[PDB]
Design a protein around this nucleic acid. Structure first.
Lengths: 210, 96, 173, 129, 165, 167
RNA sequence: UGUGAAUUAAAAGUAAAAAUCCGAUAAUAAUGGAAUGAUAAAAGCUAUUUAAGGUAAGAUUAAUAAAUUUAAUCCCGAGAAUAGAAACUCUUGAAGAAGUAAAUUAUCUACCCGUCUUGAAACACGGACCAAGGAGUCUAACAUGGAUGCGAAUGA
RNA sequence: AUAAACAUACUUUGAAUCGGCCAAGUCUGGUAAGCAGGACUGGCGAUGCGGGAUGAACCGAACGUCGAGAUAAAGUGCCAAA
RNA sequence: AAAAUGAAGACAUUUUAACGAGUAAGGAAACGAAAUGGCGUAAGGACAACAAAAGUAGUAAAGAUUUAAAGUAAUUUAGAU
């Protein structure tokens, strides 16, 4: 009967060990290279970020038609909505176009974990169901070799082969309110404002928003 | 719910229990050592305040409290030379 | 205000990828420091972010934030009329500590907001090199003055009563 | 056993301007005026009926006693709610005479059905009796 | 407020290229157009007979019919809220071969060359080569290490203002 | 609020038999149960076609049944509509399942040796559909379709509703 | 002769104590609550077994070291198997509880309705008040569409 | 690359409407106008809510009936919550 | 909207998810998983104590004035005079 549940349980454990090995091993290699570059007097250029998290800051009223279309193609259809975005020349230009309406940056692993674990959900049969078990994730993304929520987190964070199929299943997160800016959300974050690229400082804003 | 979603939580929680417990022991034994190091420093101060009485003062009034080997003592000197070079190599980088 | 050390290189046809641009930028956070750094490259070497790699962006901390030093900030700002170069001296214990004084002083005396000021350089001058009429009076070794009309100090907001009892007195302090 | 009956708005939705004119009755009518204060939901006057005020489906049409209403005109009407005496309650119609009301009340006690007009059209047995 | 003439507002549109007057090439009338080709309508004001309407200048179309002196071209036109199919017949003096698929035709040949070797490799039993990778937007650059012996440093600071007069 | 492309309106698909006909309502229940339980595309097709309106359920004559069934000898035509009789041409032997058979059409099929089933007998014999040939009639042969459009058009003119002085 | 930014020697120091500043962060936790609920067993938690594991960091020692370097033996130990436990108090109410209604008071809140208009509370028009009457109906031709009967016929 | 199955393509029948007004890192006539007329977009009309004391258009944000919490524009001597 | 169930329960079925501002204007009746749901006025044809006396009514109709209850509302219900 339900002897497969233990078989399912162990398999999730085995993948979790594999997933954490990949993230830890890749992180270790960066430190070793930085350590050796300093010894040899070289210069080390860190790799550009691959994952971007964008949040919709401004409402739905008074938006240009071209800006309106882009925010729909990024699934930022509501204020205080977060999505993950693959970083390339195509998407970076799009985010610049809608800069006054979004704030984005590069998330850490703990940010990705807390977003998926607390505010995560999937689109199953047209229904936005929150994540409640790995059996609901195995059904949703079985053919994409994602069977557990940890596998979901690892594929998002490392931007794997099936990011697009995995990302499109995740519904855009719904976040709470938080202090957006120092001055106001009418200027860029560089000017002390609210919108624009926050680089690694988006994690602090997401901490108060999750 | 965390266990149901993430069966690995039980394993990671145990290690976090170990690390929190172990790092508490390490902190306790360092504060015990630094209590004695400060204890030696205080006596080295009252003894050498006698410059008030009456004047050069003695050079080695601070007494060792940890007994270590000669191989480690040579390594302690070698490590000290490393940090002086690193602090000098870093400072000149921003010196422009 | 925090000070950053930023380096980058340009990798395209026009620029050889063996010359590194360094800077010491005072910015509230490292994202603004890069934003200032990229503008100086684009406005002085035609180097754009899309054709450049950043290498290091590290904070710089004061070596001795317990020694009083006299600073000399060379800067240029934009007014209604034109563009001018100023040299203002400041006394503080940190390089970032003096810069915040300069920004707050410029925005008060000259009514010049922060997005009109470019800090060319900041050095440390001698005790007799100070020329500010007010700041020159405190550089000597025998400075002394009584602080009169002292307002009595409250330990914390805990004892801050709206209405008091008796009379109120200042302090010769 | 009886659930908690929650009413979202216990007041009455009175027609706009009904308090100023006697020709305008208090039965509600949605204002269709192009300049109407109420239909534009001005602050202070923005109280209109909506589907959002509807009470819970479980506790809808339920009398405060915890039962529903089932009008009866004779004794045979009671026989339709004798299997559901924990759910319904007899309510004698307003035109039923006093002679017939006794028969309904007497029978409804036999069938253990509550009557909500138990003291209706009673005789003059209130003074000197 | 303009007039509704056929060739209104063509002082600059219909002007010849600077030092490009006179007769055209000989390749224009010698180029062979086949059905399904991509062409560009470019009105040549030097030839006033059969000049295409000025709204089709610069549009890219498809050859749909080859007639003895004219080349049928099919472009798309935009109307109130729809798009209609326009079928024109244009002499080769007003059209031009289009390079819209030039890059695509390069990938088609690269794949076909690879697929031609695979039937050879599968025939001989050797493992077969993979097709070329798909185009991607400029990706984030990876981690790189810069040697410390061939590096020079240039200090960057705000420049002291100098008068241009 | 939320910025959607459009708001949810009722989907324009019928999911029940139109009208108050008690028997057609029973058929919808019978095939709604079969489509849901057997999960067969055939029962889904019959259920979908049973809910079309009368104009969308055009007739099929014995002539078209004869031709479509020519290379399907041991087969059962399944048409969700009335079956009329084409008096011009002979009726071969065939088993036909349809909503209604015209008096002249049923006698022509019966005399030739065929069988005129209804939609409950077919569900009893071939519930999932095994020896069925799905058939539907033409929709564009309606006289209404001629007059739709602008008759002044250059490509496909309409047909000019006649009236006062229609020369 | 005194102070002294900085630098240098020796002692001490394996370079994790505490306090403040400066950077870095915010979340795991503990203790008090608040809003809406639930009450019963657990993919609870605990005890006993073997043992996947503990990637700076569970401990110690060794070789040495600007190491998230390599070993050794101790500990804890996830899965799984075996045994474990929750049924409560006090106050008020037919001397009127909880709720509801009416009247008054207090804080907050509230421009004249209908209409033409880009725009009316408008110094734009109609309206003193109440009752009753009061305005997309019928006939004829055509078309579309939903239900119906019959079907190369249908109606008669 | 990204998004898209209550997607996409529509078909038929028909209503109302074509007096418009405003803003602007825009333009033409004019000395100028809360003047006259245009290009692109967003609004008001058809729209309440929080802020600008008050205001059709400005700023935030668009509304089923509610409870609790972080927030937006913008504020924190009293009116007035800070 | 999608799944599940379905001759009759009942609240116009059960579960899950998204959604809910609005002038002119549209959404006729019927349609079991119902192609919007309902309230009110009058008149016509039937139904209304199932055992052969079969809706209410001089043991008090309709109307009127009020008191309370049900419904988001249109309105309905009952008490007293």
């Amino acid at each position: 009967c339900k002897a497969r549940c233990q078989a399912f349980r162990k398999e999730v454990i085995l993948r979790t060990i594999k997933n954490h090995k990949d993230i830890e091993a890749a992180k270790k290699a960066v430190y070793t290279a930085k350590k050796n570059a300093e010894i040899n007097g070289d210069l080390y250029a860190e790799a550009d970020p691959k994952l971007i998290v964008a949040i919709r800051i401004r409402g739905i009223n008074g938006v240009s038609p071209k800006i309106k279309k882009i925010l729909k193609l990024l699934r930022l259809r509501q204020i205080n909505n977060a999505v993950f975005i693959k970083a390339n020349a195509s998407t970076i230009k799009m985010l610049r176009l809608v800069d006054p309406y979004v704030t984005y940056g590069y998330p850490t692993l703990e940010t990705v974990q807390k977003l998926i674990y607390k505010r995560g959900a999937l689109k199953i049969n047209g229904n936005r169901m929150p994540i409640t078990s790995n059996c609901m994730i195995k059904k949703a993304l079985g053919d994409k070799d994602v069977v557990c929520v940890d596998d979901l987190v690892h594929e998002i964070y490392t931007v794997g082969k099936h990011f697009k199929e995995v990302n499109n299943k995740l519904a855009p997160f719904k976040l709470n309110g938080a202090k957006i800016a120092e001055k106001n959300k009418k200027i860029h974050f560089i000017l002390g404002g609210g919108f624009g690229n926050r680089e690694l400082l988006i994690n602090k804003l997401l901490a108060n928003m999750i | 719910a965390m266990v149901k979603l993430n069966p690995y939580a039980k394993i990671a929680s145990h290690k976090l229990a170990q690390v929190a417990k172990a790092q508490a022991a390490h902190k306790a034994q360092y504060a015990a050592k630094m209590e004695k190091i400060l204890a030696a420093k205080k006596e080295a101060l009252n003894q050498s305040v006698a410059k008030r009485f009456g004047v050069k003062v003695e050079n080695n009034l601070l007494k060792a409290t940890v007994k270590r080997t000669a191989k480690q003592d040579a390594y302690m000197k070698k490590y000290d030379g490393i940090v002086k070079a690193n602090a000098k190599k870093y400072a000149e980088k921003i010196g422009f | 205000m925090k000070e950053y050390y930023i380096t980058a290189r340009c990798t395209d046809k026009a620029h050889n990828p063996n010359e590194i641009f360094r800077s010491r930028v005072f910015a509230p956070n490292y994202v603004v420091a890069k934003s200032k750094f990229w503008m100086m490259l684009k406005k002085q070497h035609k180097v754009k972010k899309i054709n450049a790699e950043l290498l290091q962006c590290q904070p710089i901390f004061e070596k001795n934030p317990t020694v009083v030093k006299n600073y000399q900030i060379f800067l240029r700002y934009v007014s209604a009329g034109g563009i001018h170069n100023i040299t203002k001296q400041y006394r503080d214990v940190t390089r970032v500590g003096a810069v915040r004084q300069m920004y707050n002083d410029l925005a008060s005396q000259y009514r010049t907001r922060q997005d009109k000021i470019q800090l060319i350089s900041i050095t440390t001058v001698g005790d007799k090199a100070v020329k500010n009429p007010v700041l020159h009076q405190f550089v000597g070794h025998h400075v002394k003055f009584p602080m009169v009309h002292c307002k009595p100090v409250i330990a914390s907001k805990r004892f801050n009563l709206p209405i008091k009892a008796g009379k109120l007195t200042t302090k010769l302090c | 056993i009886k659930p908690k009956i929650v009413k979202k708005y216990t007041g009455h939705f009175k027609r706009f301007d009904s308090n100023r004119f006697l020709r305008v009755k208090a039965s509600w009518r949605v204002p269709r005026g192009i300049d109407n204060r109420l239909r534009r939901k001005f602050k202070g006057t923005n109280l209109l009926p909506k589907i959002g005020y509807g009470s819970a489906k479980a506790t809808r049409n339920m009398l405060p006693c915890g039962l529903y209403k089932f009008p009866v005109r004779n004794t045979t009407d009671l026989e339709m709610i004798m299997m559901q005496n924990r759910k319904y309650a007899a309510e004698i119609s307003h035109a039923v005479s006093a002679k017939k009301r006794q028969e309904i009340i007497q029978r409804a006690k036999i069938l253990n059905i509550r009557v909500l007009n138990a003291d209706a059209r009673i005789k003059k047995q209130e003074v000197a009796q | 407020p303009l007039s509704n003439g056929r060739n209104r507002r063509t002082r600059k549109l219909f002007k010849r290229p600077f030092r490009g007057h006179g007769l055209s090439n000989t390749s224009t009338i010698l180029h062979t157009y086949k059905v399904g080709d991509y062409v560009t309508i470019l009105c040549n004001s030097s030839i006033q007979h059969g000049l295409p309407y000025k709204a089709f200048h610069g549009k890219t179309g498809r050859v749909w019919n080859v007639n003895p002196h004219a080349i049928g071209v099919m472009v798309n036109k935009k109307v109130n809220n729809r798009i209609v199919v326009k079928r024109l017949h244009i002499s080769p003096e007003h059209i031009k071969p289009s390079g819209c698929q030039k890059d695509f035709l390069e990938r088609k040949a690269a794949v076909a060359a690879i697929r031609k070797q695979n039937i050879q490799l599968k025939k001989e039993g050797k493992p077969l080569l993979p097709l070329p990778a798909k185009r991607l937007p400029k990706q984030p650059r990876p981690a790189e290490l810069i040697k410390g012996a061939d590096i020079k440093f240039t200090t960057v600071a705000p420049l002291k203002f100098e008068e241009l007069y | 609020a939320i910025d959607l492309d459009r708001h949810h309106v009722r989907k324009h698909v019928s999911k029940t038999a139109r009208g108050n006909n008690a028997y057609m309502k029973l058929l919808v229940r019978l095939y709604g149960f079969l489509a849901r339980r057997t999960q067969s595309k055939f029962a889904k097709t019959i259920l979908h076609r049973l809910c079309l309106s009368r104009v969308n359920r055009p007739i099929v004559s014995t002539s078209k049944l004869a031709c479509l069934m020519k290379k399907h000898p041991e087969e059962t035509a399944v048409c969700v509509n009335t079956v009329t009789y084409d008096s011009r041409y002979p009726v071969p032997k065939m088993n036909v399942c349809a909503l209604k058979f015209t008096k002249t059409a049923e006698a022509a099929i019966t005399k030739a040796g065929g069988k005129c089933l209804r939609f409950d007998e077919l569900a009893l014999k071939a519930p999932t559909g095994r020896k069925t040939v799905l058939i539907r009639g033409k929709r564009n042969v309606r006289e209404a379709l001629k007059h739709f459009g602008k008759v002044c058009a250059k490509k496909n003119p309409a047909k000019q509703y006649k009236g006062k002085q229609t020369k």
